[PDB]
Write a protein that holds these residues in place. Sequence first.
Motif, PDB file in Angstrom:
ATOM      1  N   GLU A   1       0.828  -1.339   0.009  1.00 34.63           N
ATOM      2  CA  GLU A   1       0.008   0.108   0.095  1.00 34.63           C
ATOM      3  C   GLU A   1       0.924   1.251   0.039  1.00 34.63           C
ATOM      4  O   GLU A   1       1.612   1.340   0.836  1.00 34.63           O
ATOM      5  CB  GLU A   1      -0.902  -0.073   1.039  1.00 34.63           C
TER       6      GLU A   1
ATOM      7  N   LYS B   1       2.583  -1.207   4.673  1.00 34.28           N
ATOM      8  CA  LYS B   1       2.219  -0.033   4.284  1.00 34.28           C
ATOM      9  C   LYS B   1       3.588   0.713   3.993  1.00 34.28           C
ATOM     10  O   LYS B   1       4.362   0.912   4.935  1.00 34.28           O
ATOM     11  CB  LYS B   1       1.340   0.745   5.641  1.00 34.28           C
TER      12      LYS B   1
ATOM     13  N   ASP C   1       1.425   4.934   0.327  1.00 29.59           N
ATOM     14  CA  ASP C   1       0.785   5.607   1.254  1.00 29.59           C
ATOM     15  C   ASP C   1       0.983   7.252   1.228  1.00 29.59           C
ATOM     16  O   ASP C   1       2.313   7.287   1.779  1.00 29.59           O
ATOM     17  CB  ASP C   1       0.432   5.114   2.665  1.00 29.59           C
TER      18      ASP C   1
HETATM   19 NA    NA Z   1      -5.076   5.338   4.781  1.00 28.00          NA
END
Ligand code: NA
Length: 214
Positions: A108, A195, A110
């Motif tokens: 992800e 992340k 971010d």
């Molecule tokens: Na978020």
Amino acid sequence: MRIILLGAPGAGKGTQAQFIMEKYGIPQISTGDMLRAAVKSGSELGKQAKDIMDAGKLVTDELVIALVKERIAQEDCRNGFLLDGFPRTIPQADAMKEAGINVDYVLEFDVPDELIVDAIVGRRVHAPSGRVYHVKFNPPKVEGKDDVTGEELTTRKDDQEETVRKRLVEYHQMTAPLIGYYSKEAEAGNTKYAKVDGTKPVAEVRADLEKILG
Ligand code: NA
Ligand SMILES: [Cl-]
Ligand SMILES: [Cl-]
Ligand code: NA
Ligand code: NA
């Protein structure tokens, strides 16, 4: 190496795509690329995708998954693949599981919404040439003017702040359950999830990815 790379529109996840491709010797694949290329091949999946698009219709999850399954069976995905921006919903991720398409990592990418907004709304453009300036990152030499022609810069309707914010709102409402889905898949041992802080310099992000991936 099989990687899903997720990220909000405007976050810039593509800045790491070539590093990943060159690290593992894997292609970058996307449903958009599959859909636009489906016509080029003579496969029946592609013809079915062509007719859906030609009728302005939505590409169903069943069809998109079929295209993904078709794409990763091609010879260039033997070392793996970088699946860029798909799945987008939990029903699509479950359809991947139903079809048997597991990946090694979900990344992800971010970047907070405010920074994406700042990046886009600070843009100033010379529409005739497509030249793009940014009030902070890359300002014009003469205030308000295109360097080359001296013509007064404009902005794009698609870069309006209200339009960007609406886009991000819709993105997070769709993607928040998907992120939790993959975090749960990782706790179950089916995949790895990370992340990635995309606000850092690109070279530092690259280093971070090396630590996450191995
Ligand atoms: Na978020
Ligand atoms: Cl982007
Ligand atoms: Cl100049
Ligand atoms: Na390609
Ligand atoms: Na405002």
